[model samples]
Target: LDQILRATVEEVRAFLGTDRVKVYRFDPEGHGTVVAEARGGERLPSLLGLTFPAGDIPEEARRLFRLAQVRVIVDVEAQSRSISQPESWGLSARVPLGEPLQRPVDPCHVHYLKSMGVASSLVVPLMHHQELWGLLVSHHAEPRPYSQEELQVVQLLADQVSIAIAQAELSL
Candidate 1:
């Protein structure tokens, strides 16, 4: 497990070219621990083995991740641009963000990450037998926007991790 997790974090960190990448596994009690981490340039703090209380991830946020599978926060500091009022445009058309699941970073989450000096993040949910098992997380010290192709790669990686988890559980 250690070897696989180490390799996974390394591969993901290298591919993302971010300051840090980690796998955070959650327990049924709602506590989560960073199981693996790959970091570079001392820009971000190491969170390996750090545990976060359940409240860190609110129920609504977890539900969104479960349903969406992935969440991308391009830049915490970037302003969210809303579509013009339909009445003003005389067209009654309401345009949503490119990704319907996309939303402005929650203020508390933004504050938390900012306190850690992370300016951007991308998260992919790891699932096991239809249950949300954990999260594959990437953090950048500066604002970073992932391309669609990159997001696809992250999704694939998360799926592979989920498969590994299943196999490991069976063996155990």
Candidate 2:
């Protein structure tokens, strides 16, 4: 189980060229703990074994994760401009998940990420027993864009992770 999660983060970080990729597990109380992490470069800090309060990942976000199956933020700054006003540069704030959200980026959310030194982020749900099991997250230091193919790749990887989780029957 450990090796599978470890290899996943390594493979994903390499493919995404992101600063960090991690497998985050949610406890019964909905708090998140980074069980496995792969730091691709010094762009982002290591968060292995770190626990985040439940408030950070509220129920609303978790519901969206299951609903969309994938989340992608291209660039916080681009989202800012796209939110306030449509820029001719043609930057879409949020990529289409499963159902597709037409809403622009939330300024409050963008501010939170900018303050945290995150230019972009992606997340895909890892399911078990048809419930929200955990999340596979990728954090990038700079503004990053993902094509449809790239997004599909990440989703496929997450699917593999869920299957592995089912077979492993383990935890960190």
Candidate 3:
């Protein structure tokens, strides 16, 4: 876990410009336990050791896990692209800046981000061997969509996470 976390933080920070990121792993008990976090600015609650019930995640997100695909949300108001909204998808979206529009995090995730003054974010799925391994959560201060280049950079980070997890599992 430590190795994956350090590698994720160091690698993501080198490029993906965002506020904070949390990588949560699925534990044996069917819960996601945060294993690592990286932040470009003010940090929030220590996500490490935090566990979210697996059921809390929507089935749609899980389906993506099976699909071995990626999801992108340029705006929150942007109608639910993925068939799974509440569960598979978090309240965050990835959009670039200066779009002449503004969308905030879902009301459900607002207060949490507001407390930390994070107004924008992106959630990228990390997959390994056709399974959901973890997620790359990225944040921004004000309203701004992530640039195309930034999104590609984040995808690279997601790839790294998947690779790190795969390597760890093999070593065990």
Candidate 4:
């Protein structure tokens, strides 16, 4: 598990050239626990040791999680802008799990790109034996849509992260 988590963080950051990467776990009560963060230079004060209750994530994201697929957020602002219900989101992107989630970047998300200064981002589910265990996240400093190849590369990296998490947990 440790190896998986480490490898996931290393691979995604390397492939996407992002400054931050993270893995968040979920408990039965339906909450997100930020278990690990791979920092490059900047630090997110709101993210470190932060936990999002079930309400923070909407139904769409959680539904997709059950499906088990990759969720890419090339432009967060653009996507959120197009969203009919923005108040529900707590200023974050919730990429669904699956290939379809890689749909074209939204203009609203582009607005977010400029506002938050986040260029590119992606999120993939971390599965442990068919159960949703956590998530793999990647980010970049510039605004741009991630290519399919780039997304795939990061996907492989996410797999590595899963391994690291497993390694880290087993010793305990």
Candidate 5:
């Protein structure tokens, strides 16, 4: 598990050229721990092995990630110019199936990232048996935009990591 997680973060960080890349796994109780990380510079604070409270990622956000499979914050300082929404977008209500959840970045999350000096981020959900297993998160110290092709590559890496986790568990 350690080797796999280590290599995963290394490859992802190299590919994204971000300040830091981490594999954050959530416990059954919803708390998250950074299991693996690769950092290129001292720009972003180190979160390796640090655990975050369940409240850090409310139940609603967790549900949405499991449902949407991915989320990206291109830039924390970027204005949300969306002109429409259901108002209760990130709430616990039933977002229509098939339609992805489209909402502004959570203020609290933006604040938290800002505190860590992360200006942009990309998050992809890791699934295990249809459950939300964890997250592969990339954080950039500066505002960074990923091209569509790069986004696809990250998605593919996430999928590969999910499968690798399943297989590793079986071998163990």
Candidate 6:
């Protein structure tokens, strides 16, 4: 069970072509841990097995995880983009930054990524029966472009992870 999840990120990291990709699972109390990780060319440190406090991924950020199923940080130095998916094959739409204009990047948030050598990132929440169970994260060492098509594909990848989680629960 745990083995397949590690393999999931290995392939996902390749699809993302990022410096690092990982799975972060959340505990019931909100604490999170890096349960799986795949690195590219050893550019970033291995974060697997590291445990982080709930405050690290603040409540407001968690709220948006469900609001925007897929969120991209184009660059730690740049602003954010949120892509909301439809329930059916309707299509996905991008949410305007706060208003109709782009929002400013939080300095602290930027520094946080910078410290980890993550210039850009993509985050997709892994939901278990509507509850957020974990996060699929991709971190790029340099700024890169991400298209709507790519986001759509990654959203599907997140669904695969969700199913695996359910499968694991059922098997147990």
Residue-level lDDT tens digits of model 2 in 1-172: 7677778888777887766778987777877788789886666677887788676664445555655565666677567432434333312455334333523455666677787688777766777534777888677777656557766876677778888887788554
Q: Please tell me which predicted candidate would have the highest TM-score against the true structure.
A: 5
Q: Model 4, range 1-172, lDDT digits (tens) per residue?
A: 4345555555555655567777778777778776566766555443657776576445656556655465666555344433434233322365433334445544644665456456667776666545677777676775576677765665565566556566677778
Backbone clashes counted, model 6: 0
lDDT of each: 0.70, 0.68, 0.59, 0.60, 0.71, 0.69
Ranking according to lDDT, highest score first: 5, 1, 6, 2, 4, 3
- What's the lDDT for residue 112 in model 3? 46
**In candidate 6, what are the lDDT values of residues 1-172, reduced to their tens digit?**
5687788888878777778888888788877888788988766678888888676675545655756564566665455534332233312365322442343345666677888877777777767544777888777676666667767877787787788887787887
Worst 10-residue lDDT window for candidate 4 reads 83-92
Pairs that collide in candidate 2 are none
Model 6 segments more than 4 A misplaced: 77-103
Model 5 spans > 4 angstroms off: 81-102, 144-146
Ranking by TM-score: 5, 1, 6, 2, 3, 4
Best by lDDT: 5
Determine the backbone clash count of candidate 1. 0
lDDT, residue 24, candidate 3:
69
State the lDDT of candidate 1 residue by residue for 36-115, as single tens digits.
89998666667777788776776545655655475766577684333322222112243222344446665666767777
lDDT of 5 by residue, 1-172 (tens): 7688888898778877777888987778878788888888765567887888776676555666776675777576564333323345544465534243434665666777788877777777766645877788777677656456756876677788888887787887
Could you give the C-alpha RMSD of every candidate to the true structure, in order shown?
6.4, 7.0, 7.1, 6.7, 3.9, 6.5
Off by over 4 Å in 1: 80-102
| lDDT for 170 (candidate 6) | 82
lDDT, candidate 4, at 109: 48
